[PDB]
Amino acid sequence: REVKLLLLGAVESGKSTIVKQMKIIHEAGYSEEECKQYKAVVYSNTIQSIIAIIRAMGRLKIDFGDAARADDARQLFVLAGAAEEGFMTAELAGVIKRLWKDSGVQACFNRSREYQLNDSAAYYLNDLDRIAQPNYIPTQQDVLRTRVKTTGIVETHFTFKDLHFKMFDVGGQRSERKKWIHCFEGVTAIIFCVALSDYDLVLAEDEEMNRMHESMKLFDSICNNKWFTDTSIILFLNKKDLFEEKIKKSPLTICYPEYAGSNTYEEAAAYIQCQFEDLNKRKDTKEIYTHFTCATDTKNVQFVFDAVTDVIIKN
Numbered sequence: 407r408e409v410k411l412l413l414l415g416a417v418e419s420g421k422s423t424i425v426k427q428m429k430i431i432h433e434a435g436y437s438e439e440e441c442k443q444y445k446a447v448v449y450s451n452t453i454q455s456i457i458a459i460i461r462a463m464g465r466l467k468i469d470f471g472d473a474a475r476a477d478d479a480r481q482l483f484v485l486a487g488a489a490e491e492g493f494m495t496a497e498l499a500g501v502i503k504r505l506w507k508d509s510g511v512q513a514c515f516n517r518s519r520e521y522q523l524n525d526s527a528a529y530y531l532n533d534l535d536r537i538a539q540p541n542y543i544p545t546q547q548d549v550l551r552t553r554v555k556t557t558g559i560v561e562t563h564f565t566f567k568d569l570h571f572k573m574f575d576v577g578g579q580r581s582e583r584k585k586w587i588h589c590f591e592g593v594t595a596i597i598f599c600v601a602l603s604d605y606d607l608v609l610a611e612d613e614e615m616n617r618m619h620e621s622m623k624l625f626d627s628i629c630n631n632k633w634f635t636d637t638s639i640i641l642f643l644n645k646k647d648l649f650e651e652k653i654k655k656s657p658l659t660i661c662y663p664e665y666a667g668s669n670t671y672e673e674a675a676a677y678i679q680c681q682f683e684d685l686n687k688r689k690d691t692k693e694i695y696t697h698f699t700c701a702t703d704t705k706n707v708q709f710v711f712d713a714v715t716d717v718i719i720k721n
């Protein structure tokens with residue numbers, strides 16, 4: 407039997423990451439010379455992250471801890487504002503390192519909810535020593551942590567439990583098209599991704615438009631959509647890892663001011679699940695299957711997928 411799966415969700419919820427995890431787990435996986443192809447993405451990802459923080463400092467009126475840093479800030483734009491592709495040298499690596507390490511820079515970094523910063527900003531920056539190497543070759547995790555906007559509809563075929571799957575990633579924009587989406591009316595299952603860590607984030611261009619709400623609004627559209635009653639709805643409350651760390655310093659009340667529980671991972675996460683599951687009108691007939699995930703964690707996606715597949719077979 408062939409199972410069709412449609413990944414839906416806002417931008418940066420983890421869709422391509424899950425697609426990548428399917429290749430790694432169910433297919434070949436990323437080869438040494440396949441990883442080399444992201445050597446660049448990794449550099450580009452890293453350069454942009456640091457530039458964003460440095461650029462935010464001004465916007466937020468934050469000062470370097472050391473003034474000799476301003477000379478490094480200037481040097482970053484010279485090396486970056488010269489190259490056209492993501493590269494990496496030893497001088498560049500020094501600049502970035504000294505900046506990363508700076509107190510004023512760390513201060514701006516801890517107020518990242520105020521600006522737009524790649525989630526993996528910190529990961530690449532804390533391993534610059536390693537990714538900066540002359541022969542550096544990205545690892546699977548480095549590839550799973552990259553950030554590439556998928557414009558087209560991506561798909562994958564893998565086999566699992568004598569079942570052949572066909573995953574479709576349409577992206578955020580197309581998840582929205584109320585009409586278009588109709589072309590997918592018979593889908594076996596739909597995996598809807600939500601980024602838990604977005605609760606205290608604003609949607610850039612909109613800057614006052616909370617993202618979790620935007621996702622909540624989209625979940626509502628699909629969930630209660632005529633074309634998917636016969637379609638299973640799986641909810642991946644993704645980024646549980648960054649949520650665990652954020653929740654202990656950024657209250658849920660920022661997202662849900664009516665929240666009265668306490669701000670612990672267990673209570674707050676449960677509050678988010680409920681808010682989503684409750685958007686389901688046909689709650690009588692239709693059941694939503696929720697899962698807390700970490701798309702970059704291959705062990706998690708695997709355990710979790712085994713679970714998803716066990717449900718699809720059952721119904």
Ligand SMILES: Nc1nc2c(ncn2[C@@H]2O[C@H](COP(=O)(O)OP(=O)(O)O)[C@@H](O)[C@H]2O)c(=O)[nH]1
Nearest residue numbers: 417418419420421422423550551553645700701
């Ligand atoms: N820490 C962390 N990073 C994640 C997780 N899921 C995805 N990412 C990162 O999220 C950013 C965007 O994810 P992506 O899968 O490109 O999302 P898409 O826009 O929905 O396809 C990338 O940097 C991903 O590596 C997660 O659970 N935890």
